[PDB]
């Protein structure tokens, strides 16, 4: 039983990898393939071949029964043709023009396929598009249950936690950036959470991209804190690893944009999620 494979390509945010991995792990999972997590060409690592896995997670052979590669074995295993979507079939020189266009038309080539009763005769299934909503909720709950941060990451949420969330009930918020009008909004946000009844007393946790945001919003409420502060690029990396775990553990969550993959893993596990959509609203979880 020749070995068949599913290989999980994607460079760009967390959120939307972790969420696209979720759904490559699930076609893998139902057809019975290795998953092949390739993370190369990371917009946090400056080396274009080197895998980036490895630089966040520790060594994983295995999710949930199926066997996993992902590491610089990318670099040195063929993986076997026939390859789905067919765009991946061609020649490497007739690949070298790969516009957005061609991406979208594989997001979409991949949905079918995943929708489709029958497995692809395809012997590789190359996902090298974005595949969020793409798999079951359990699907993305076991992806992140499954895999395990490097220790220097863990360490750092786990102080973090110590120094401010073990005791308390935090609103965690994140701020992705008329100004005036954003800022409003989101002050009214946390005031609508900050409303809310909790088991114990009450902090603010800050994501965001603005400092002038982090500024502001710590200068109108009480209790606001944040994460403090080639190397950039992995430092950035795990700063935005550190946000997406520690929001996980708030009792509210605030998402400003709740289209943002960043909060997709506190809207999963946090029991009260805050979300404009303008009007704020809220969804109890569960």
């Known amino acids: 039983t020749k070995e068949r494979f599913v290989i999980s390509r994607r460079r760009t945010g967390f959120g939307d990898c972790l969420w696209s991995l979720a759904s490559a792990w699930s076609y893998a999972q139902r057809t019975g393939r290795t998953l092949v997590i390739d993370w190369r060409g990371s ?5 274009p071949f080197s895998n980036a896995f490895p630089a966040f997670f520790e060594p994983v052979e295995d999710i949930a029964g199926v066997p996993v590669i992902c590491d610089d074995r990318v670099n040195q295993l063929s993986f076997p043709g026939p390859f789905f979507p067919r765009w991946w079939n061609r020649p490497s020189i007739d690949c070298i023009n790969r516009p957005d266009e061609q991406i979208f038309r594989e997001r979409d080539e991949l949905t079918e396929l995943f929708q489709a009763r ?32 490097r220790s220097e990451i863990r360490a750092r949420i786990d102080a973090l936690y110590e120094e401010h969330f073990s005791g308390h009930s935090i609103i965690g ?3 992705r950036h008329d100004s005036e009008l954003a800022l409003h909004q989101v002050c009214m946000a946390i005031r609508k959470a900050k409303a809310l009844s909790y088991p114990k007393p009450v902090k603010v946790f800050l994501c965001t991209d603005s400092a ?22 992995i430092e950035g990396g795990a700063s935005a690893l550190i946000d997406m775990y520690l929001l996980a553990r708030c009792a509210t969550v605030i998402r400003f944009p709740p289209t943002s993959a960043f909060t997709r893993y506190a809207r999963l596990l946090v029991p009260r999620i805050i979300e404009f ?7 109890d979880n569960p």
């Open 173 to 175: 918020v994140h701020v």
């Open 277 to 283: 959509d303008g009007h704020l609203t809220m969804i």
């Open 212 to 233: 002038q945001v982090l500024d502001q919003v710590s200068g109108l409420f009480p209790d606001v804190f944040a994460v403090p502060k080639a190397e950039m690029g």
């Open 43 to 47: 917009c946090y690592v400056e080396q």
């Open 118 to 149: 029958e497995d692809s005769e395809a012997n590789t299934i190359v996902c090298d598009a974005c595949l969020m909503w793409r798999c079951s909720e359990e699907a993305e709950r076991l992806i992140f249950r499954n895999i395990k941060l």
